[PDB]
Design a protein around this ligand. Structure first.
Ligand code: ANP
Ligand code: MG
Lengths: 55, 500, 50
């Protein structure tokens, strides 16, 4: 703020950069891997309860 | 702040108020003969009326013989010469840290006045027989080959010698860079301040270098002292001495400095130049008679003080440049026998891919294991001797007559050990990165792995050890000694990974 | 900061050069006060050392 040539310019930029800004992030709405986990257990892991157990 | 030019004019107002000798007889080639200066000391500083400073070296009967710190265009016959009343001396103290100064310790960086805790002389008696101790602290360079083969100690003098363009400066540099590990800490007694003396180097080359120091945030704990190519022979000759004092401050005050003399071959070239021109009769290869004394008294100034004296160390890495690999030429011979061991770098080694091009065969540290870290010591048991036996079997291999299971065995390991010590410039490694590498090589876990692939082994290994067995890596570091169980965890840990 | 420092340093260098030129011109304009002060300074210095 004391090294810059133009008055009240560093002070204004500092205040806006320390608040909040956008970022490349997502939410847990598109749960593609969570929905597939139940189906994979129900066809591969649950098949052993009746095939491996009978053998 | 509010007319800064007015504050400088008011402080430099009243100064000249109490200033009311010899005349010059002849002047040429950095030398001035001078009639008078009757009360002058041998090795005293003198100002010429013109401004340029000089040093008295030949107090003869009729006249005094002066080497100049400057050019001489500015000195004329009859011009009045003046006594200083002081022997050449330097500012010292931690104020120098970060600064680039000339031989007399003037800022040449642009960063303004040096603040000094005091002033030492350029020539100072080395600490005696009496106030010293055994070298027992490592000065870790982070150079696999060096820290396992020729381990350097806080207090020891260690020669770096080889031809031109072999990597002498590179070894010294990579050492400095490493100290970051400890200098950004707060434990003053683990810290190592570096002094880099540029002797006969071109300026841009000192530049190119301070840049790299900064690119590595390494400048905050260094002091470069520069007597570049163009400066007066006297400044070149002097620099190492002035520098030795700058870092003597650290040693005297409980801390540890590291002085790199890059390089003495030039200091002697210049010291030759004062003498031939002062007309002192020459020694071998036109050098002066005591060109040995020159270096001996500097290098002895490195030492590791006793507890009574503050336990401060000063450690020296002089550099020396040979020609055509000849180490039997005057100066190298001199210094070779002055120091506590050497690292020989070789051009042949270089071009076939050993970099650092250290010559294990010829490199020694005479302190030895005393200055190695216990852990490194433990897994480096016998490596250096083995690597010798390896060159042995590899010389017998040239007969190209069939090998047995014993010779092929040690050939496979030596080749992989060789390869495991290769290292990129600017990448010093922590001890705990070094240790498992060495252990993997020595105990022969590397021995069934392609030679071109040992490159990838190294980083892939370290990546995994950080990821998984970080608890070991942090013990090695904290403890510096592989306890019996730690050998176990490490043993397991390595095998594990070698099966991919 | 580099531009502010360069401007301040240029101004100080320009002011010093203008002050130096004025001091040299004044001495060449036969100064009667300089000649009288040079003789009185020499006598005072020699009496304090003897
Ligand atoms: N480990 C390394 N890997 C690759 N190149 C290196 C290594 N060490 C040094 N070099 C290179 O080899 C070149 C010369 O190295 P240098 O460190 O200046 O040796 P030197 O003996 O000081 N040469 P000089 O003092 O100018 O005669 C430099 O360009 C470095 O990049
Ligand atoms: Mg070099």
């Amino acid at each position: 703020r004391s090294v810059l040539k133009n008055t009240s310019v560093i002070d204004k930029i500092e205040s806006y950069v320390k608040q909040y800004k956008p970022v490349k992030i997502d939410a847990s709405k598109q749960l593609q891997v969570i929905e597939s986990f139940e189906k994979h257990a129900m066809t591969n892991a649950k098949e052993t309860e009746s095939l491996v157990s009978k053998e | 702040p509010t007319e800064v030019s007015s504050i400088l004019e008011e402080r430099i107002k009243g100064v000249s108020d109490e200033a009311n000798t010899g005349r010059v007889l002849a002047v040429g080639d950095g030398i001035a003969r001078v009639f008078g200066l009757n009360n002058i000391q041998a090795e005293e500083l003198v100002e010429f009326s013109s401004g340029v400073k000089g040093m008295a070296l030949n107090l003869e009967p009729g006249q005094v013989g002066i080497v100049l710190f400057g050019s001489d265009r500015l000195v004329k016959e009859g011009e009045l010469v003046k006594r200083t009343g002081n022997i050449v001396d330097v500012p010292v103290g931690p104020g120098l840290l970060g600064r680039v100064v000339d031989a007399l310790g003037n800022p040449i960086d642009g960063k303004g006045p040096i603040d000094a805790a005091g002033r030492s002389r350029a020539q100072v008696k080395a600490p005696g027989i009496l106030p010293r101790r055994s070298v027992h602290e490592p000065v870790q360079t982070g150079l696999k080959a060096v820290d396992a083969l020729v381990p350097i100690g806080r207090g020891q003098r260690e020669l770096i010698i080889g031809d031109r363009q072999t990597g002498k400066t590179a070894v010294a540099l990579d050492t400095i860079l490493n100290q970051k590990r400890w200098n950004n800490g707060s434990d003053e007694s683990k810290k190592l301040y570096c002094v880099y003396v540029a002797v006969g180097q071109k300026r841009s080359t000192v530049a190119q270098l301070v840049q790299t120091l900064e690119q590595h945030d390494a400048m905050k704990y260094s002091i470069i002292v520069a007597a570049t190519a163009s400066e007066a022979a006297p400044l070149q000759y002097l620099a190492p001495f002035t520098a030795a004092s700058i870092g003597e401050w650290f040693r005297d005050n409980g801390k540890h400095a590291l002085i790199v003399y890059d390089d003495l071959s030039k200091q002697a070239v210049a010291y030759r130049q004062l003498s031939l021109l002062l007309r002192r009769p020459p020694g071998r290869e036109a050098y002066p008679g005591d060109v040995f004394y020159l270096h001996s008294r500097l290098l002895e100034r490195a030492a590791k003080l006793s507890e009574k004296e503050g336990s401060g160390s000063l450690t020296a890495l002089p550099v020396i440049e040979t020609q055509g690999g000849d180490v039997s030429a005057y100066i190298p011979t001199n210094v070779i026998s002055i120091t506590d061991g050497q690292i020989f770098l070789e051009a042949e080694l270089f071009y076939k891919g050993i970099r650092p091009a250290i010559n294990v065969g010829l490199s020694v540290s005479r302190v030895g294991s005393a200055a190695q870290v216990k852990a490194l010591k433990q897994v480096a048991g016998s490596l250096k001797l083995f690597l010798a036996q390896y060159r042995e079997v590899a010389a017998f291999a040239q007969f190209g007559s069939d090998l047995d299971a014993s010779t092929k065995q040690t050939l496979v390991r030596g080749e992989r050990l060789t390869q495991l010590l290769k290292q990129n410039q600017y990448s010093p490694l922590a001890t705990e990165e070094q240790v498992p590498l060495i252990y993997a090589g020595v105990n022969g876990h590397l021995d069934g792995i392609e030679l071109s692939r040992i490159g990838e082994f190294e980083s892939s290994f370290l990546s995994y050890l950080k990821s998984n067995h970080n608890e070991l890596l942090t013990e090695i570091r904290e403890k510096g000694e592989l306890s019996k169980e730690l050998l176990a965890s490490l043993k397991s840990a390595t095998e594990s990974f070698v099966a991919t | 900061v580099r531009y502010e420092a360069s401007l301040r340093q240029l101004e100080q260098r320009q002011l010093a050069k203008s002050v130096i030129s004025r001091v040299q011109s004044e001495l060449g304009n036969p100064k009667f006060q300089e000649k009288v002060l040079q003789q009185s300074i020499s006598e005072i210095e020699q009496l304090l050392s003897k």
